[PDB]
Design an enzyme around this catalytic site. Structure first.
Site, PDB file in Angstrom:
ATOM      1  N   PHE A 253      -6.258  -5.775  -2.584  1.00 43.23           N
ATOM      2  CA  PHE A 253      -6.162  -6.740  -1.452  1.00 43.23           C
ATOM      3  C   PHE A 253      -7.273  -6.606  -0.387  1.00 43.23           C
ATOM      4  CE2 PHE A 253      -1.590  -5.684  -2.489  1.00 43.23           C
ATOM      5  CZ  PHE A 253      -1.362  -6.807  -3.282  1.00 43.23           C
TER       6      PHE A 253
ATOM      7  N   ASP B 237      -5.299   3.889   4.553  1.00 39.26           N
ATOM      8  CA  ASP B 237      -5.168   3.127   5.793  1.00 39.26           C
ATOM      9  C   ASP B 237      -3.724   2.604   5.862  1.00 39.26           C
ATOM     10  OD1 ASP B 237      -6.186   2.026   8.145  1.00 39.26           O
ATOM     11  OD2 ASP B 237      -6.518   0.101   7.193  1.00 39.26           O
TER      12      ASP B 237
ATOM     13  N   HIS C 250     -15.654  -0.753  12.318  1.00 38.23           N
ATOM     14  CA  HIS C 250     -15.245  -1.792  13.268  1.00 38.23           C
ATOM     15  C   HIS C 250     -16.428  -2.117  14.163  1.00 38.23           C
ATOM     16  CE1 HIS C 250     -11.000  -3.007  12.788  1.00 38.23           C
ATOM     17  NE2 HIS C 250     -10.882  -1.854  12.147  1.00 38.23           N
TER      18      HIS C 250
HETATM   19 NI    NI Z   1      -9.583  -0.334  11.041  1.00 40.65          NI
END
Ligand code: NI
Ligand code: NI
Lengths: 379, 361
Positions: free
Chosen positions: A249, A272, A194
């Site tokens: 995806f 995740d 991130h």
């Molecule tokens: Ni994340």
């Protein structure tokens, strides 16, 4: 109390695939891996009807599933329930992962994990703290409110609780290098993610102590001509592991096999995953927003990908079936590699004597049939 | 003449593995490989019932099968018999291979091949002469139009011998050889591009003398043929070789009479070798030849060498196609290539084949 042997199956020990062998399990431990016709006369036995036997899958990124989300119910019991949900898809160990939130939210997950792993070992093996010290330009779903820079305080906290914290994901490009080294000192794994970092920034980060990337290709600087970025940095660095969501995806399959050729045993399969996974749902709340479950994909009402519903066994399957990676190797990306990556590989990730009995059993169609955890068998 | 489509299968085109696609065949050629929803409304299709579809296998070393041996019956029909034997294991192209003794023998092989190849294309791709000097090479070169490949031991031949053959269009393979690393490496410079059953009959790799396998390992453009029956080379060796050799590892059978045929014994140039539990032996019980089949080879590498099915498939199809330079026409499933395909199931049982557009069973 007495031992039992698993029997009639293709065994993927992680170094070898064995036919006409069995595993005697003794309490929470594997006792031998040996040719079927060596088992003592009246040794208790479990015929796996020729199915596949691998170690249980280890998910290093899991926000919740089984219909729950760790971020709402930040409790020890939420963990428990995700754990059983995992088991129905052959996942035996994971990192209850808590996304970017209040310092106080953080303080209780610390407790929640501590409570759980006092009670049960080898299931949740530490928290994954994903955020808050991230970059706004690569924010994803992570609220524009609780993303912040790393303050001395809350790292000090994270470190003092290293004995229940397994991994932090953070964006190095604007936080103290001190903080990275401190966490590494503390025995915590620091993962880049991130992050709007430059290739050379990520490289610095690695050098301070970062050894993991979270969800490669997701919320990172892409590799470009004049800027290798984070995906570049990762490719260029032999020691850093990269998690990857293989659900067709999040990243394109081709990207996964390219990634696997480059990174080999440093590529890790990760879900995740979110509430839907292992459950049946209509939708749910990912800190704030309504994420509809529409026949496999997570989607905010537009149809824009919302999150992940991947299951560990599906990840292995897809890797084998779409990515073109051989089954044995794909198993490893779900087991040995993550173990190594979080330094639990002395006891999990491999089927061999002395190691913990955390196995999974699945058919040729990638149906998980049963699960043995600490020696406990269950279907 | 109408086009038809093969449909309902995993398609291993060799570049991609495709699902809910079809391949449409027109003449003896692939016309397209496209998603099922694109087939013309009224185009007859063969429903393969979700089985796998690949290019047909190409086996560049084959002495015999279906009960026969090219060496004893050096006829065009023997070639026909074995081709027909092959289709049961998914093999739609091969090099009929002869261990030369006499030149009378070798001249017959030339005749038989010329004769067969006149009548069919894309099945026998040419002779593979293995063994056994000036005047021999001339004869081979003179007949390059039916000879695809020669195996020889370069420690034993004028380098010009290799150059002429290469120039002729033949492929020269190192095999049966006592060569040093630096000898092999020299032959490769002269024009050798292939190696005949890697590990078998060739100077091993030692610490102080890499030998032939060493040379092969060190020379990226040499193809290595390999027998994956778990008898000729240990599966770990194949694993290792694949990692070194990548796309230049070719799956070969080197098979004999008992391959794809219910059979008790046979003469292999000399001794009578028996067929006990799908394996060739003496009454002694030593290895006496191969009975391996292309599909079993693909299966074995998948199952005990640890290679992914699509790559295994490529070792059976595109790599051998490249090795003898026919990959412009055979070895991939794509528009304009020749339509030789093999269908098989989950458990590696061949169900049909298509040779030049003709379907079977
Ligand atoms: Ni994340
Ligand atoms: Ni030979």
């Amino acid at each position: 109390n007495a031992m039992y042997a698993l029997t009639n199956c293709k065994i993927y020990t992680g170094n070898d695939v064995l036919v006409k062998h069995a595993v005697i399990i003794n309490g929470d431990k594997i006792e031998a891996v040996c040719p079927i016709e060596s088992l003592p006369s009246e040794m208790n036995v479990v015929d796996l009807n020729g199915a596949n036997l691998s170690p249980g899958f280890i998910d290093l990124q899991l926000n919740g599933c089984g219909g729950v989300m760790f971020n709402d119910e930040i409790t020890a019991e939420t963990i428990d329930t995700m754990h059983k949900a995992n088991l129905k898809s052959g996942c035996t160990s994971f990192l209850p992962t808590l996304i970017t939130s209040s310092d106080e939210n953080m303080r209780q997950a610390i407790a929640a994990a501590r409570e759980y792993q006092a009670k049960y070992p080898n299931q949740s093996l530490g928290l994954h703290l994903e955020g808050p010290y991230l970059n706004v330009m690569k924010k994803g779903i992570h609220s524009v409110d609780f993303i912040r820079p790393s303050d001395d305080t809350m790292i000090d906290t994270i470190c003092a609780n290293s004995d229940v914290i397994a991994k932090v994901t953070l964006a190095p490009e604007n936080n103290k290098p001190e903080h990275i080294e401190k966490l590494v000192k503390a025995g915590i794994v620091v993962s880049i993610g991130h992050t709007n970092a430059t290739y050379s920034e990520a490289r610095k980060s690695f050098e301070s102590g970062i050894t993991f990337a979270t969800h490669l290709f997701n919320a990172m600087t892409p590799m470009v001509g004049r800027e290798p970025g984070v995906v570049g940095a990762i490719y260029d660095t032999p020691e850093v592991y990269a998690g990857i969501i293989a659900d067709g995806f999040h990243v394109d399959y081709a990207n996964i096999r390219i990634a696997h050729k480059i990174k080999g045993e440093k590529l890790v399969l990760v879900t995740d995953a979110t509430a839907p996974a292992g459950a049946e749902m209509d939708y749910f709340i990912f800190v704030g927003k309504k994420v509809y479950y529409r026949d496999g994909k997570c989607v905010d009402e537009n149809g824009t990908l919302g999150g992940s519903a991947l299951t560990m066994i599906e990840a292995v399957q897809n890797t084998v079936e779409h990515v073109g990676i051989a089954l044995d190797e794909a198993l490893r990306m779900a087991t040995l590699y993550p173990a190594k990556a979080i330094g639990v590989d002395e006891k999990l990730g491999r089927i061999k004597k002395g190691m913990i009995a955390n196995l999974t059993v699945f058919d040729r169609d990638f149906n998980v049939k049963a699960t043995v955890v600490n020696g406990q068998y269950e279907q």
